[PDB]
Amino acid sequence: STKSIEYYLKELKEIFSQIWLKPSEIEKRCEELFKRSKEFDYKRILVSGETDNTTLYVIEDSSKIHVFSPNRDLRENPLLMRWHPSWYEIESKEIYYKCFLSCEELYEHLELPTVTLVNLCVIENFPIPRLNLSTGTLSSYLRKEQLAKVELIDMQVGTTINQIIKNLLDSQPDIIGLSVNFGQKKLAFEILDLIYSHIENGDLSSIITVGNVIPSFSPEQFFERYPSLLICDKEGEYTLRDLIKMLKKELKLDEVNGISYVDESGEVKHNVAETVNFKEEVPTPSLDILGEISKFRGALTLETSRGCDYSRCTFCPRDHKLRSWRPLSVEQTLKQLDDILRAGKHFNIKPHIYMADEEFIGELPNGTEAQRIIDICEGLLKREEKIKFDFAARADSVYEPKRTKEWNVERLKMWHYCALAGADRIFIGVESGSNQQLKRYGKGTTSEQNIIALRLVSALGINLRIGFIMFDQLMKGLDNLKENLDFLERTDALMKPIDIGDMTYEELYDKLLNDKEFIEKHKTGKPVYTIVSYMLASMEILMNTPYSRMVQLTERKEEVNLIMNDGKPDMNMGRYATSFVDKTNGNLSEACQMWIDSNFGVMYTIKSLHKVANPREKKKLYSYMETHREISHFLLKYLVYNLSPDKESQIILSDFLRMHSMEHIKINVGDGSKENILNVMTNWQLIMEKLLRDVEADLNKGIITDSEDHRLHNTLKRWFSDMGNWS
Numbered sequence: 001s002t003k004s005i006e007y008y009l010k011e012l013k014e015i016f017s018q019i020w021l022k023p024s025e026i027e028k029r030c031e032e033l034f035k036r037s038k039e040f041d042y043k044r045i046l047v048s049g050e051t052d053n054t055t056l057y058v059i060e061d062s063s064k065i066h067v068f069s070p071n072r073d074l075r076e077n078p079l080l081m082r083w084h085p086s087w088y089e090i091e092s093k094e095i096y097y098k099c100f101l102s103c104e105e106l107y108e109h110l111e112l113p114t115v116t117l118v119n120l121c122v123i124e125n126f127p128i129p130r131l132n133l134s135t136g137t138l139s140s141y142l143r144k145e146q147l148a149k150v151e152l153i154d155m156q157v158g159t160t161i162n163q164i165i166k167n168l169l170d171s172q173p174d175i176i177g178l179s180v181n182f183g184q185k186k187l188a189f190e191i192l193d194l195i196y197s198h199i200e201n202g203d204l205s206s207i208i209t210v211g212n213v214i215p216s217f218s219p220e221q222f223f224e225r226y227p228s229l230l231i232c233d234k235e236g237e238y239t240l241r242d243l244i245k246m247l248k249k250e251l252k253l254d255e256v257n258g259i260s261y262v263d264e265s266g267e268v269k270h271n272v273a274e275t276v277n278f279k280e281e282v283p284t285p286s287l288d289i290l291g292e293i294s295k296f297r298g299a300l301t302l303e304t305s306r307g308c309d310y311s312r313c314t315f316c317p318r319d320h321k322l323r324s325w326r327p328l329s330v331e332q333t334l335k336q337l338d339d340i341l342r343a344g345k346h347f348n349i350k351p352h353i354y355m356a357d358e359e360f361i362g363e364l365p366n367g368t369e370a371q372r373i374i375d376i377c378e379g380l381l382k383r384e385e386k387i388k389f390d391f392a393a394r395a396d397s398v399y400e401p402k403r404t405k406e407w408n409v410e411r412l413k414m415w416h417y418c419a420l421a422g423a424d425r426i427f428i429g430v431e432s433g434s435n436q437q438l439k440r441y442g443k444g445t446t447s448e449q450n451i452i453a454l455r456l457v458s459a460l461g462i463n464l465r466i467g468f469i470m471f472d473q474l475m476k477g478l479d480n481l482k483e484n485l486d487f488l489e490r491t492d493a494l495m496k497p498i499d500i501g502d503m504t505y506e507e508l509y510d511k512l513l514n515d516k517e518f519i520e521k522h523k524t525g526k527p528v529y530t531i532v533s534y535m536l537a538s539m540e541i542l543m544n545t546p547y548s549r550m551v552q553l554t555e556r557k558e559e560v561n562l563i564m565n566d567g568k569p570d571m572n573m574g575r576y577a578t579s580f581v582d583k584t585n586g587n588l589s590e591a592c593q594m595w596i597d598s599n600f601g602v603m604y605t606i607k608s609l610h611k612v613a614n615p616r617e618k619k620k621l622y623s624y625m626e627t628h629r630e631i632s633h634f635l636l637k638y639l640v641y642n643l644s645p646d647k648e649s650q651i652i653l654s655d656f657l658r659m660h661s662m663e664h665i666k667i668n669v670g671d672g673s674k675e676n677i678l679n680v681m682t683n684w685q686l687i688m689e690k691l692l693r694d695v696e697a698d699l700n701k702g703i704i705t706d707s708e709d710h711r712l713h714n715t716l717k718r719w720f721s722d723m724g725n726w727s
């Protein structure tokens with residue numbers, strides 16, 4: 001009945017617009033819509049597809065199948081196309097409904113396997129969830145291709161191991177997948193143990209696979225305990241597509257995209273992974289978990305590109321994330337952002353997107369990457385409500401003197417468009433302020449280039465954070481630390497938001513690079529270390545990095561053992577434990593870790609109180625955090641001074657101590673032993689005591705308010721009693 005068809009499509013379009021509902025809830029509303037007339041009886045229904053291609057099949061029986069596609073021309077349906085590549089007329093108006101009569105094989109295509117994907121989480125360490133793209137994009141890929149019914153389970157929202165197993169027994173999946181991230185080995189093994197014990201009991205029958213970086217990097221530890229396990233080495237989309245084909249006996253195991261496995265002869269095999277056509281095959285992440293994420297005050301995410309076109313930083317392994325850059329189209333980027341924002345608004349989640357991209361800006365062979373960003377920004381600026389979004393970028397995505405002035409001026413224009421469209425907290429992978437160390441890091445940048453990048457981005461009103469790895473194991477002598485400290489103390493890098501007014505981009509660019517009076521007029525006066533993400537950080541050497549091979553090459557070249565655990569990496573953390581080739585630098589790195597450990601409880605408590613404090617207490621608690629960061633920066637300057645004094649550092653340290661009334665602060669000069677370094681740090685810790693005595697007095701005076709369990713009182717009391725104790 002054509003009147004009922006129109007009514008059914010219109011009602012389905014309204015049902016399918018609720019893209020946060022899980023497919024079972026969508027199906028419930030579809031059953032209630034089709035049971036609303038006794039003038040139609042059916043045997044079963046199936047919903048597949050997603051967002052703008054969601055599709056309902058009403059199976060009257062296997063010989064009469066109705067198909068409704070309210071959001072897209074049915075001729076583009078991939079399931080129907082696999083069943084019959086010429087079922088439709090190439091020249092007709094778009095069709096949104098079709099009844100298929102006596103199409104026996106079509107029923108088999110509609111018997112979709114079930115795939116359950118589980119995101120693991122150690123909720124103690126990560127209490128605030130973010131939309132999980134690892135599983136969300138695998139789900140949406142499979143739904144859009146109409147390859148499987150997908151169930152999503154996310155431990156971020158509190159689902160326990162026993163609730164996962166209960167869920168699996170109820171859903172009876174054909175494929176179970178776990179996303180296994182840093183620190184999740186023990187959780188993964190516990191869940192896998194229970195999965196296989198229930199397979200053994202006849203309660204489950206499933207292909208089991210694990211993915212993400214931890215099993216990809218260390219498969220042997222997984223194969224040793226679970227010999228039949230299949231590991232997804234890189235992207236999961238085509239892997240899951242091919243496991244579904246293998247389920248149907250349409251592929252052999254040695255044909256499945258991008259997996260590692262133990263074959264019949266007990267040998268580990270690897271299958272080639274074809275890089276996913278991300279541009280157009282991976283839609284909006286599935287939003288099944290979003291409602292629960294909003295209850296935990298969680299965050300929206302999106303990945304608008306995959307990979308890094310640079311891929312040369314020596315500490316950044318590329319084997320899992322790959323060495324080429326694959327962007328979403330502009331149109332698709334804007335559609336997916338619209339979807340996530342609309343769904344977030346339904347749950348009152350604030351319109352703040354955390355971009356997952358390793359490289360948001362990218363590089364294209366035709367050189368149009370900046371225009372792509374400007375087009376995305378122009379699309380965001382057409383929206384009715386403003387948004388904010390965060391992303392990461394290299395310093396040379398801002399400023400690159402090896403490129404023409406015209407390229408850099410167009411780059412500044414692009415960054416301005418990012419600011420206009422809502423770019424908020426941007427992370428720049430500076431990593432070092434020492435030209436030698438930058439080269440050991442494979443960053444390709446100079447110290448001065450990093451300063452200028454920060455100047456340009458901050459002048460646009462964007463709110464920067466930088467990565468900074470102060471210590472690295474191959475550093476010889478103290479020169480690179482002195483260079484780093486000098487860089488971090490520069491006050492000519494961070495600019496206030498500059499009113500562009502009637503300046504051209506070229507005028508703004510020229511003034512920020514060359515006009516010393518202009519830079520002075522507009523600086524915030526804050527040193528670079530104020531935007532460092534993690535102070536006093538030391539290099540953590542991951543598996544499969546150029547830096548690990550540089551260390552292994554130094555072990556041979558200088559006949560010294562640097563990689564502990566008998567050269568073996570940690571499977572759970574995907575990284576080596578490595579000593580420093582320069583024992584003094586190793587001692588300085590160790591002391592800085594002990595400094596961090598010694599302040600962690602009190603500073604964690606101050607940070608926790610700050611999140612929920614009134615405006616006046618918020619500023620007081622923030623001032624403690626600023627002072628702590630300052631004391632932590634000049635701790636290292638003080639340690640280096642006591643090993644290698646110079647007059648310039650003597651003045652700076654004396655000025656700082658005088659500003660804090662600690663000029664008095666059994667110390668050997670030039671002595672790099674652990675014992676002397678600890679004695680020096682015990683002395684500097686008296687400055688931290690001075691800060692915490694102000695915190696203590698403010699707490700006692702009622703100027704700041706403690707938590708209900710008296711956490712600040714308790715951690716302060718312990719801190720004072722632990723002074724000069726190190727471990």
Ligand code: B12
Nearest residue numbers: 133134177178179182183210211212232235236317356358
């Ligand atoms: C958000 C994020 C975080 C958040 C995580 C929060 C959370 N609740 O998830 C925070 C800030 C805490 C974080 C911390 C760290 N991170 Co981080 N993080 C990211 C980021 C920016 C996005 C992750 C994402 O959404 N990716 C997009 C999804 C689609 O990719 P995916 O997870 O890899 O999933 C795909 C495949 O792995 C596969 N797959 C995944 N799961 C499964 C499951 C199955 C069954 C199958 C078949 C396939 C499969 O299919 C998916 C689709 O193709 C990535 C960069 C990136 N673009 O990946 C870095 C990144 C993953 N992080 C990285 C690192 C190094 C860290 C830290 C170790 C940093 C540090 N030194 O402290 C810590 C680790 C903390 C910890 N203990 O877990 C590195 C990983 C190493 C590498 N490959 O180079 C990355 C790549 C960034 C970088 N280049 O430095 N991180």
Ligand code: SF4
Nearest residue numbers: 308311312313316358
């Ligand atoms: S650190 Fe950043 S720029 Fe360097 S290879 Fe990794 S993702 Fe690319």
